[PDB]
Amino acid sequence: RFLCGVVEGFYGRPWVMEQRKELFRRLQKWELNTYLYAPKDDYKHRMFWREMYSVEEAEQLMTLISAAREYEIEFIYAISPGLDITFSNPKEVSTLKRKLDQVSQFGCRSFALLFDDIDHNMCAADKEVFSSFAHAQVSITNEIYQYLGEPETFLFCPTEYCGTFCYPNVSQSPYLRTVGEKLLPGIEVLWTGPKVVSKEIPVESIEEVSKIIKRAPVIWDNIHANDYDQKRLFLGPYKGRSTELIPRLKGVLTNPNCEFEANYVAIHTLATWYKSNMNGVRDVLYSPQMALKLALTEWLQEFGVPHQFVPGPNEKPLYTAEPVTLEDLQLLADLFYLPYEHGPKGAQMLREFQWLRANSSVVDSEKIEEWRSRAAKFEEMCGLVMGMFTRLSNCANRTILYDMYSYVWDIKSIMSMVKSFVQWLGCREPWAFRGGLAGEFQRLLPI
Amino acid sequence: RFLCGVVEGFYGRPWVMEQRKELFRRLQKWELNTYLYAPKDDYKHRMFWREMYSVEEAEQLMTLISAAREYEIEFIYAISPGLDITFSNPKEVSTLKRKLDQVSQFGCRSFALLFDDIDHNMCAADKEVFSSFAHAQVSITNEIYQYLGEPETFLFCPTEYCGTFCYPNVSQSPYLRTVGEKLLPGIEVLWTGPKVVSKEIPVESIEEVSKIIKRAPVIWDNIHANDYDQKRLFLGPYKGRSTELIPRLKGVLTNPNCEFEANYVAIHTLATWYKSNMNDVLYSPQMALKLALTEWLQEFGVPHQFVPGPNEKPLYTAEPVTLEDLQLLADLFYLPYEHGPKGAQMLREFQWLRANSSVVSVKDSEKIEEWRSRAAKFEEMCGLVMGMFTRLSNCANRTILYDMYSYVWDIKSIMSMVKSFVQWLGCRSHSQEPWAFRGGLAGEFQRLLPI
Ligand SMILES: CC(=O)N[C@H]1c2[nH]c(C(=O)Nc3ccccc3)c[n+]2[C@H](CO)[C@@H](O)[C@@H]1O
Ligand SMILES: CC(=O)N[C@H]1c2[nH]c(C(=O)Nc3ccccc3)c[n+]2[C@H](CO)[C@@H](O)[C@@H]1O
Predict the structure, then answer these.
(1) Is residue B325 part of an annotated ligand binding site?
(2) Beta strand extents in B80-229 (DSSP E only)
(3) What's the CATH fold of domain A1-285?
């Protein structure tokens, strides 16, 4: 029994009910099976976790939860009291129990408590009662689990949720030792890998942590998350996780880009990864590059779908004529690929620009003929980025357009300027302030 | 009779009909009077300008247009055929006329044709008929104006819409000379100032262009526009335009931030500017900003028992957003060519602290006592940016939060890192997550250009 799907677990503008219904639809089509409701800034999830849902809010959650059952996706409600709960106050524990009973009235059978992103300092009352921060968390968690009748799937996200957050390391952490010994066996534990955004999750890192917490964990995967950097989007393939992991894990829930429509590849490729080795034996039949092409070829068909004049010989041609192509989306993904890696064409544009700039002073037959055609070849590629933008700009599926618009505009702006610089090397409005104030502070730090 | 209000004229995700109704409401409250519909990427405005509105789309525009009349705001429908219209084809002129009469069926009396952001190269058919690119534009424009019964308000946006786009300059441009001589007198002309994003619009620049186009222009102001830079937001006051301009202008329509809720200051301060000299001691940008933020503050506690003990952990949400929080936020995200006082000041102190870092380990009391307290004072201010973020994060008006979230998160992330660097400089006889790749690929190209 493997939990595989999406966690809406990011900071900023949560997804709306229409979009979450559409997610369940896509999860089912791709044979994924789980959704974890945990938007950091949906106010009643974390900030105002004590407040009960209003009647209007209750109706919308009921409809959402029925939608999940309709598409055979497990709905897990998570809640995050960590910032200001007094763990030892029964009033407080009761308020929590009320909130979770209210949601089970909506049709929800599966739950989670999250203690990611808080500090370890308890108040004085909690210090007296509980001998450590883990002892307090495991107390209310085991209690809530029992009060709800020991539900089939109940998740706990630790404060020390990855390799680099474990004090002083994973195998000797007093926080995790306590979680493994005292947290009841039928509660599953969330884990993001060796780091918060793990480039790779080695099998041996999972064996390690699996010993100290005493279960196979469920992975909260931040590979395609983009809440942490305004300028970033991730359209590259699920990567850096061996299919070998699957028999050593309880699940994988990916926390993907904030912009709903940009997660076609992120979720599609996760599904191809899961489906490739669904139930193994306790080294890959999964190719990230092949998975990316499957995903983009399918995504392409969404762009011509909402969510005569044919000019003469002498006349100005339709600006809309040409539709988005597979090569356009292949280019876009390489430009906005993965947290620790650009895609081939992106890496390659950067390498040619680095070369062209460093060998500029040349402007000798040998070196000129090289620089001139290399530069013309680079203008042509910068041309391909403009062409991509323009064809996206005209596509019928405006919903997708709007989710990406600001990223596609940014990359074509920069390539358009970079093209101008290379044209200016061959010939011998707000921009000084670029990135605003934040940009100026960033330029004064060791990059 | 002065046209003052907002043009929705930017690139990216247009505003939705609920938000435009709310805009009319705000325009009325502040005694502004005009809205110009012109979203670059609302598909039937420009890309698919030939396509008529569907029944569903027609109902929504009708409701929007009635909403405008209800709030006493002039509704101006603009259209942008410039990218692919063949000017000399009657079929093409007819398709344009159809589109504009469809919208007048919806209740619209005021119109506009826009030729910003296209190149000057005409097709071969148009070269034969018309002797220049201006001659073509002024032809269809005068014709459409007459066909619509010479409406009281009709706007034309030129291709050469500012100082720096005028070939070879404004006073000797053949494009503009043609527009001034031949464009019919009762059509008004849009203009963005000396540049696309004008820091200042001098009175003498307006006198100049007013001669060659032969009217007072209407300003399309891009002062608070932010479609051109992912990381930028503008919450500073309307600034750099003298109240003297008003009797020399036909109007001012501001093209503000993409994120609807961030335009409280931009529009509020424009209204204070217009109202100050309706018919330059009279308008102070700094005073106007405080009026605006004090009013905005009241929206943050409005959606769009347990009281913890002595020994217990207090409510994390207890403290609400304050006026000082929003004053700080605006200085951090102020104007295109200028940061606000506190922002400028944080940057100056950081620049100083970094450059005088070596003072930490060298025997020097004078310079240490200075660096230590200057640094502590800087930690305190970086503290205030986190405090701002966290109180915004808890505010009841989630609509506003969500519009700004990504900007407020970015600045508090960077200040939090910048604080760590200054703490690390103070521990210098004493020795991770995605950051090398910060800004993504685009960031790497930007770092290799002369800034
Ligand atoms: C378990 C987890 O990933 N929790 C949150 C989380 N927490 C963190 C960090 O805490 N990161 C961090 C902390 C200190 C210094 C650098 C980075 C990142 N994330 C994710 C990516 O931004 C975010 O979406 C998520 O809500
Ligand atoms: C009249 C006008 O401002 N037209 C458009 C416009 N046009 C331009 C440019 O002309 N941009 C430009 C020109 C040369 C080099 C870089 C950018 C900017 N803008 C505004 C700000 O991006 C945009 O919101 C607007 O629709």
Answers:
(1) no
(2) 110-114, 154-157, 188-191, 218-221
(3) TIM Barrel (3.20.20)
